[PDB]
Design a protein around this nucleic acid. Structure first.
Ligand SMILES: [Mg+2]
Ligand SMILES: [Mg+2]
Ligand SMILES: [Mg+2]
Ligand SMILES: [Mg+2]
Ligand SMILES: [Mg+2]
Ligand SMILES: [Mg+2]
Ligand SMILES: [Mg+2]
Ligand SMILES: [Mg+2]
Ligand SMILES: [Mg+2]
Ligand SMILES: [Mg+2]
Ligand SMILES: [Mg+2]
Ligand SMILES: [Mg+2]
Ligand SMILES: [Mg+2]
Ligand SMILES: [Mg+2]
Ligand SMILES: [Mg+2]
Ligand SMILES: [Mg+2]
Ligand SMILES: [Mg+2]
Ligand SMILES: [Mg+2]
Ligand SMILES: [Mg+2]
Ligand SMILES: [Mg+2]
Ligand SMILES: [Mg+2]
Ligand SMILES: [Mg+2]
Ligand SMILES: [Mg+2]
Ligand SMILES: [Mg+2]
Lengths: 115, 100, 151, 126, 82, 99
RNA sequence: CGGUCCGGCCGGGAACUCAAAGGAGACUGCCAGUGAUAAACUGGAGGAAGGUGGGGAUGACGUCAAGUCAUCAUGGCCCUUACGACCAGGGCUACACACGUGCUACAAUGGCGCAUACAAAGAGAAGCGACCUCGCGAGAGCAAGCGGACCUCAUAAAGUGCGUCGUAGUCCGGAUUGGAGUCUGCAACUCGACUCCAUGAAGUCGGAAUCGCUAGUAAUCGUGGAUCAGAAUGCCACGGUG
């Protein structure tokens, strides 16, 4: 249940349960359970214990909760602190990939906000 | 359109169809596979020195009569209005007004 | 329409049984033209009801629709300077057309896990005179006696 | 010796052949349950064989091309109700009373100009 | 991004100019009206001045910028706030 | 065998142009395989009419390329020659094709 | 019919679907009844279609000095080292906000994974580009086929069967952001589409007021085309369930 930093729920299946980590979706979640010899409709409960003892070996060869968040929020700060155009669209809080902002920039601009 | 734009088009088409030997013997060397990786870098510096207008991308189909750039049709060759004025007089063959 | 008095159109019979009553009822369960899943949900719930009541599969339906046909209802006039409701009697076709519509309007408001169960519950309840169908029927049927001074 | 029909529903063209026999139903070299999904399609493909009492006496060969799952059912219905009129011909009054001889002249209705579907307008403001 | 197998883009009139200007050294700011070049590693430590729409804007280029193109340090339209 | 296409825009001008070929083959010899009606491509076009701003007003035109095809089975020398003697009115295209 | 690799494929056949030329067909023509004896109308008989059989094409006289001099032509006027003309780089795409039109959802009539059937109408030579191999995938590699009922684009999806899922911001929903890539293209920084690995916001059917539709219709599902080197959730088309 306690797998790679933070806990994992037990009632869910293995493939849907391993996605609770920050940095595994439905591709690495089948990479782990096909490079560690486990099925895909057994739960975190009614496993064995050595299966977790090798699943924890398999997961930590990627970059996970610490490393992903530090690398992503490293690269964001690096892009900020030059003057790059993605940097200015970061440090104004406006969409970066070239969205139309005459309307509908709301996911970057937060809420709907009168003057 | 203006009286200069059609002159610009008949000045562009001449260059773009004159240099058609070199821009299928630079893109070959660039987009090949087994060629030289130090000649693939000079055949990409020639392509910015062949003159800019000589390129079969840089021209919009003007009308064959007026010069209106928008609303083309490729098959007739005339614009949105000067196909209507011919097809409602009879100069384009087989072009009856459709219904079904 | 204003002028052309027109006819109520034909319909296919049901696939399984042989009653042209169920032809409207499989249609009112439907969204977006997919009549096959409507033909499936109903023929599952009309077996689950046929088991839970201990009655025959065709006969567990009419004696639960009997408790949700109305007899009279209101419309609106405003002839003079005043809106009147009017208790008019109801036509023998629109009777069933209202009956089979209230049940399906109710059975998309339960909390169960499947449409079959949501309709088997909604038919057993209106077979035992409780539920969100016959309560709506009580409201409609009481707005006649609250307005029988209008006619 | 065999008899023949031809029917057209929405966008289908059935082609039916009747012989005296036991009741075999073959469609594009498939048995009748292997082709069709829903029991109403198995109803409507059989319906005029039930209407007159001629399920048992005859076998039939059917080929259908193009259309939808209802098109290749109504087409075979119109096909058999034609092809049984070349069997005994006093079936015709009761098939006509039953309403099976009339080919449905409905078809998909085209999309006009400035109408986002065949009759749906776009929306409206003032 | 570009296709990789064509290699990176740079104008000839800035490539030959920058290989001359390294081997003559002067930090007189080199101006350019070519804001589409992938900055090369031997352009590390130069003061160029890219057009922005109105005038040149000066850009002192370090190790960090060498992936990008010369436009992304010339913000184009001015903005202050409503 | 020798097959000829006929393309036209008008089926009162394709039929004389094909009867003047069947009554050339059946006057130099025999064994023509009739006209066979191929499919008919209808190249539609839809244009606006108003010169400035009316997106809900349109003219729709079509062009209906009529095909025909004619085979020739056993050719003599005069059978192939009296066909290339023959021209046709404008509007009709041909393309002779041995096999 | 006969061979058949059980593939109309291959001798064959002209029947049938179908492709298209010319015709037959529907007229209130026929039986009854109400009628002012007429005009019609209401039922029903025959028919594939009943009363205009269903759709389209066609928009009277004219009106608001309606709309464009920016498609084109124009009467007068204004400019002529400029209001003309060539070039690089920017700009139409900015954003505190308001309105109009659409797409995707808020889930069990539904997500995901496996197998399994049935369409129509189009387009294609600087073009459509199958087969075969390398790539997890966009796609690069090689080179047949076709001015096309021959060849391609092309697999239909909704559906049907067997699982999994169990009412949760959810295996619902995909917004936004980071890393790595492909293609057309002189060139994707302001600004291209697309695929993979991450990220998983807002939203539990929506206030007053309002919008479309009378039968193959509304409602949902996919496919094509025009403009186009690349680039539409709109536009124009055709069918599937109904
Ligand atoms: Mg993850
Ligand atoms: Mg993912
Ligand atoms: Mg262009
Ligand atoms: Mg009406
Ligand atoms: Mg309004
Ligand atoms: Mg409007
Ligand atoms: Mg519009
Ligand atoms: Mg009758
Ligand atoms: Mg009648
Ligand atoms: Mg005005
Ligand atoms: Mg103007
Ligand atoms: Mg002019
Ligand atoms: Mg310019
Ligand atoms: Mg604009
Ligand atoms: Mg709003
Ligand atoms: Mg599922
Ligand atoms: Mg194309
Ligand atoms: Mg491969
Ligand atoms: Mg999802
Ligand atoms: Mg991802
Ligand atoms: Mg919320
Ligand atoms: Mg809920
Ligand atoms: Mg395109
Ligand atoms: Mg449709």
């Amino acid at each position: 249940a306690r797998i790679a930093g933070i806990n994992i729920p037990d009632h869910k299946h293995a493939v849907i349960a391993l996605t609770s980590i920050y940095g595994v979706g439905k591709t690495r979640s089948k990479a782990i359970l096909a490079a560690a010899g486990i099925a895909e409709d057994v739960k975190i409960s009614e496993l064995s214990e050595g299966q977790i003892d090798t699943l924890r070996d398999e997961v930590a060869k990627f970059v996970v909760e610490g490393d992903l968040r530090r690398e992503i929020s490293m690269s964001i700060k690096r892009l900020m602190d030059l003057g790059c155009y993605r940097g200015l669209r970061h440090r104004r809080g406006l969409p970066v990939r070239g969205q139309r902002t005459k309307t509908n920039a709301r996911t970057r601009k937060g809420p709907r906000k009168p003057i | 359109a203006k009286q200069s734009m059609k002159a610009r088009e008949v000045k562009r088409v001449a260059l773009a169809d004159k240099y058609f030997a070199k821009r299928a013997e630079l893109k070959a060397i660039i987009s090949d596979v087994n060629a030289s990786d130090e000649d693939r870098w000079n055949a990409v510096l020639k392509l910015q020195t062949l003159p800019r207008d000589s390129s079969p991308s840089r021209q919009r189909n003007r009308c064959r009569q007026t010069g209106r750039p928008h609303g083309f049709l490729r098959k007739f060759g005339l614009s949105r209005i000067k196909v209507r004025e011919a097809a409602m007089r009879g100069e384009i063959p087989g072009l009856k007004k459709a219904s079904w | 329409p204003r002028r052309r008095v027109i006819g109520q159109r034909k319909i296919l019979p049901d696939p399984k049984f042989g009653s042209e009553l169920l032809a409207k009822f499989v249609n009112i369960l439907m969204v977006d033209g997919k009549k096959s899943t409507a033909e499936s949900i109903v023929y599952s719930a009309l077996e689950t009801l046929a088991q839970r009541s201990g009655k025959s599969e065709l006969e567990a339906f009419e004696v639960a629709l009997e408790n949700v046909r109305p007899t009279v209802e209101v419309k609106s006039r405003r002839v003079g300077g005043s809106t009147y409701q009017v208790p008019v009697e109801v036509r023998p076709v629109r009777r069933n057309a209202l009956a089979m519509r209230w049940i399906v309007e109710a059975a998309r408001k339960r909390g169960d896990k499947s449409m079959a169960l949501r309709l088997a519950n909604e038919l057993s309840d209106a077979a035992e005179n409780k539920g969100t169908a016959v309560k709506k029927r009580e409201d409609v049927h009481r707005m006649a006696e609250a307005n029988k001074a209008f006619a | 010796n065999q008899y023949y029909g031809t029917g057209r529903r929405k966008s289908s063209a059935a082609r039916v052949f009747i012989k005296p026999g036991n009741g075999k139903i073959v469609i594009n070299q498939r048995s009748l349950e292997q082709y069709f999904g829903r029991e109403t399609a198995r109803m409507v493909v059989r319906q005029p064989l039930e209407l007159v009492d001629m399920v048992e006496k005859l076998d039939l060969y059917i080929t259908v091309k193009g259309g939808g799952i209802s098109g290749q059912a109504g087409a075979i219905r119109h096909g058999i109700t034609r092809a049984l009129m070349e069997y005994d011909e006093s079936l015709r009054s009761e098939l006509r009373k039953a309403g099976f001889v009339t080919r449905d002249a409905r078809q998909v209705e085209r999309k006009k100009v400035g109408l986002r579907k065949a009759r749906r307008r776009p929306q409206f403001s003032k | 991004p570009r296709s990789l197998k064509k290699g990176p883009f740079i104008d000839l009139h800035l490539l030959k100019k920058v290989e001359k200007a390294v081997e003559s050294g002067d930090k007189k700011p080199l101006r350019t009206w070519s804001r589409r070049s992938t900055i090369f590693p031997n352009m590390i430590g130069l003061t160029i001045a890219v057009h922005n729409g109105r005038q040149h804007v000066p850009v002192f280029v370090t190790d960090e910028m060498v992936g990008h193109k010369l436009g992304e340090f010339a913000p184009t339209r001015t903005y202050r706030g409503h | 065998r020798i097959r000829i296409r006929l393309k036209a825009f008008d089926h009162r001008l394709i039929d004389q142009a094909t009867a003047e070929i069947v009554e050339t083959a059946k006057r130099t010899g025999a064994q023509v395989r009739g006209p066979i009606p191929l499919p008919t491509r209808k190249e539609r076009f839809t244009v606006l009419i108003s010169p400035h701003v009316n997106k809900d007003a349109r003219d729709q035109y079509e062009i209906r390329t009529h095909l025909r095809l004619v085979d020739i089975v056993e050719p003599t020398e005069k059978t192939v020659d009296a066909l290339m003697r023959l021209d046709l009115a404008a509007g009709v295209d041909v393309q002779i094709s041995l096999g």
